[PDB]
Scaffold this active site. Structure first.
Site, mmCIF file in Angstrom:
data_model
loop_
_atom_site.group_PDB
_atom_site.id
_atom_site.type_symbol
_atom_site.label_atom_id
_atom_site.label_comp_id
_atom_site.label_asym_id
_atom_site.label_seq_id
_atom_site.Cartn_x
_atom_site.Cartn_y
_atom_site.Cartn_z
ATOM 1 N N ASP A 32 -9.405 28.082 29.508
ATOM 2 C CA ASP A 32 -8.254 27.241 29.211
ATOM 3 C C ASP A 32 -8.089 27.001 27.793
ATOM 4 O O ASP A 32 -8.767 26.152 27.233
ATOM 5 C CB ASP A 32 -8.419 25.914 29.947
ATOM 6 C CG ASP A 32 -7.126 25.126 30.062
ATOM 7 O OD1 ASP A 32 -7.006 24.347 31.007
ATOM 8 O OD2 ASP A 32 -6.227 25.269 29.212
ATOM 9 N N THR A 33 -7.096 27.656 27.203
ATOM 10 C CA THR A 33 -6.810 27.503 25.784
ATOM 11 C C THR A 33 -6.041 26.163 25.433
ATOM 12 O O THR A 33 -5.891 25.815 24.257
ATOM 13 C CB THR A 33 -5.968 28.678 25.257
ATOM 14 O OG1 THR A 33 -4.671 28.636 25.848
ATOM 15 C CG2 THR A 33 -6.626 29.990 25.602
ATOM 16 N N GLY A 34 -5.481 25.514 26.446
ATOM 17 C CA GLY A 34 -4.781 24.261 26.235
ATOM 18 C C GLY A 34 -5.746 23.079 26.319
ATOM 19 O O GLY A 34 -5.410 21.970 25.926
#
Ligand SMILES: CC(C)(C)NC(=O)[C@@H]1CN(Cc2cccnc2)CCN1C[C@@H](O)C[C@@H](Cc1ccccc1)C(=O)N[C@H]1c2ccccc2C[C@H]1O
Lengths: 99, 99
Positions: free
Chosen positions: A25-27
């Site tokens: 998860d880059t967010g």
């Protein structure tokens, strides 16, 4: 590797001798894991996602093996549906985003 | 471009002729924008995340533009501090995770 986004990008990590699935998860700024009693002393933090704020237990200097790459960082443990690994551990393995 | 995760991955998008900023989020199935009016019709949709479920507004076929690439897709609108670019649109611009 080069992982596509047609499905949820899930990889296998290792937390204290147990192998489990987790989402890249880059967010997410931090790594939020499921319910487990990790060795060590914890301290509360209240993080906020899409459907509200959750009460998680913060654990420090924990060893994680993301695909054979032994790395180290902070892992928050709380009531989450899926294990999620955030930007804190991803930079450690050199994960980038391309397009 | 190649984007690293030391700082949160934010790109400049264009939606409605106005320039906004958004977070490339691979942990999000869908794309959720900040409360606003889009020139299309909407239906309700319940999405879930960290904390619980929330009700958003599902607009379809809105012409977004992420870093030069002009895309058309399903965009949700709801209560959020950051604009989120989910997998539905990321696959459309060819985004991949490399490590
Ligand atoms: C560290 C922590 C986890 C609390 N951070 C977040 O949750 C951030 C918050 N910000 C900023 C923020 C936004 C609102 C309130 N506080 C902070 C916006 C983005 N979320 C990041 C998302 O990528 C998180 C994922 C986690 C998840 C994925 C799958 C299963 C359950 C939970 C997320 O919520 N994604 C969901 C999702 C997201 C968008 C659209 C549809 C869906 C379904 C699902 O993909």
């Amino acid at each position: 590797p080069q992982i596509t986004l047609w499905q949820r990008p899930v990889v296998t990590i290792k937390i204290g001798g147990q192998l489990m699935e987790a989402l890249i998860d880059t967010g997410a700024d931090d790594t939020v894991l499921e319910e487990m009693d990790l060795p060590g002393r914890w301290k509360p933090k209240i993080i906020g996602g899409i459907g509200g704020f959750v009460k998680v237990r913060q654990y420090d200097q924990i060893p994680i093996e993301i695909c054979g790459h032994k790395v180290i960082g902070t892992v928050l443990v709380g009531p989450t549906p899926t294990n999620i690994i955030g930007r804190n551990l991803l930079t450690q393995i050199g994960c980038t985003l391309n397009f």
